Each structure stands twice: as structure tokens, then as C-alpha cells.
Amino acid sequence: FREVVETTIIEGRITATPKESPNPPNPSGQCPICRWNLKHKYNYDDVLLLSQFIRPHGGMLPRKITGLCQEEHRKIEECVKMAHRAGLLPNHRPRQLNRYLTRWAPGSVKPIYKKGPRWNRVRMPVGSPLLRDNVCYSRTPWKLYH
Template sequence: MAAPSLLRGAFRRLFAGLWGSGWVSPPARTLREVVEVTEGNTTIIEGKIIEVAEAPTPPNPSGQCPICRWNLKHKYDYVDVLLLSQFIRSDGGMLPRRITGLCMEEHRKIAACVQMAHRAGLLPNHRPLLPEGHVPRKPRLNSFLLEEQKLTELIAKSVFPPPELENLVSDSLVRQIRKAHLEERT
């Protein structure tokens, strides 16, 4: 009596394994496009599998952390909120290294950039929940120096104002600013 039930159980496991292993079902990670075809009175709705291009390979696949692998070592700043938000929790704290996969050096740099972004007010949605009845103090609103490129763009805009604003600034002042700017460049 026990032998037939054991055999049935073994066959079920065998066929369940075949069905689950991909003989019957398509691969799990595919995109499908729903196609509706109407022929006379019949409507056929089918899902066609879309071929997806492979993910790009990193330029430095032997790098030990994601930032080293994609050659981003000295190319990010506290202003790159999209990059920083990948390494922080919803309450604004840093995720641990074992989860992010960052090396120690990059983890420290990312932590410093996250702290600077918090202080500059660039991550407003990543604040810890305050206890009930707690009144937060007024933020200090830190601001940091702009990078050299951004600073020169701002200087150029202030030295050479747009034509519609030139008539508001006195001509002698504009000439003095332009002269000082040209002397600095030489």
C-alpha cells in the first residue's frame, strides 16, 4: 500500500521539476508584449516575448566596488543626489558596506557627500521620523563653495549681463567689471 503512494509522489516530484525547470514555462525574466489579433468573430490575445538587449558591461570589471567598476572614483560630488540616494536608507542613514558593496575608501567618501547633501538641504525626503511632540530646530542651511566650472559660469553671467539687463546697469560699472575680469584672465 505504501509503495504505490511513494511511486506517485516520486512521479509528481519528477514532473513538477520538469515543469518548473523550464520545459513547459518560458524563462522568468522576460518582457512580453500583449498582441490582440481579431480575425472575423474570434479575437486572439497573446503575449509575445520581447528580446531585451544585454546589460552594458562596466569599463573596469575587475574593480572591487560599483564605483571603481564604473570608473566614477573622482567624478561625483555632494550635488549628485541620484547617485547618493542609491546608498542611503529612507530615513537618510547610510546603508552598510555589506549591502552596498562599496570599498572602505568609497564608503567614507559617499558618507561625507551624503552628510554634505543633508546639510545643504538636497535630500529633503530622506529625513528621520521625529518622536511625537518634538519640535525640530531651525535648519542651519549650510552652503558649500561651487566647483570651479560652475563658478566661472556665474562670473561670466555677472560680467556679461544679457542685453535686456544691460540698460539697468550703468555703463561705467559694466566696463570696470569687464576690465577687471580680463585682467584676471591674463
């Protein structure tokens, strides 16, 4: 990457460009996640994979720089949203309730003051619907609504 060194003098200094491991198991892919056989085999738990695709200030990297697929970049963006609210990224701040599997913003959900009847019950959304088609090791599927 490059950095903007300012002091008035301002310059752009190129420092410490990384690279991948030289052995992808699944070449000739489209996105690097497909290149490593990770299409449906990750969650919000792994934060190294999520941290390789974020700015140091917690922001999201864009598409063409990362080269991700549409569905897969949406999966990374939503998983980064879910992992920031779960406290899994403490070193990406600009400068208390514990959570996990959080879809919406904390200050944008109204409480369910009146849940409906059994046929029209308002339920609490748990976990992103973008992660439906992941590998399941149980036989009961992911209950996305509680």
C-alpha cells in the same frame, strides 16, 4: 528588499528588488563606483548617486551590502553628511539657514571669537578633505579652509 508588515500579526514580505544596468564600462572592479569609472569624478552635488546608497530614513547603508571600498565608502558617507545639511535630501526625514559644503554638525562648532595673527590664523573648514583627489578643472586647487 523586505518589509516588516505589522498589525497582533507581524510578517516579513519581500517586495521590489532592484538591479543595475547590465552594461558596466569598467568590469572586474572591487566597488561598484570603480565599476562605472567614477573613482574621482563626483561631489556632493549629485544626489542620485548619493541616494542610491542611503536608507529611506536618511541613514547610511553598511559596507558589505553595498560592497564599497574603504576610501570610497568614506567618501559616500561624508558626501551624504554634506548633502543632508545642504537641504539636498528633503524626502528622507523620519516623519532656517541655507548651507552647502558643510563638514561638521551645526550644533558642535564653537564660533571663532578670536582668530589668530596672520601666521597662526584660525580658518573655517570648507568642504571635506576626503574629496581632495577629485578631478580639477581649474588650476587653483580646492581651498579646503577659509
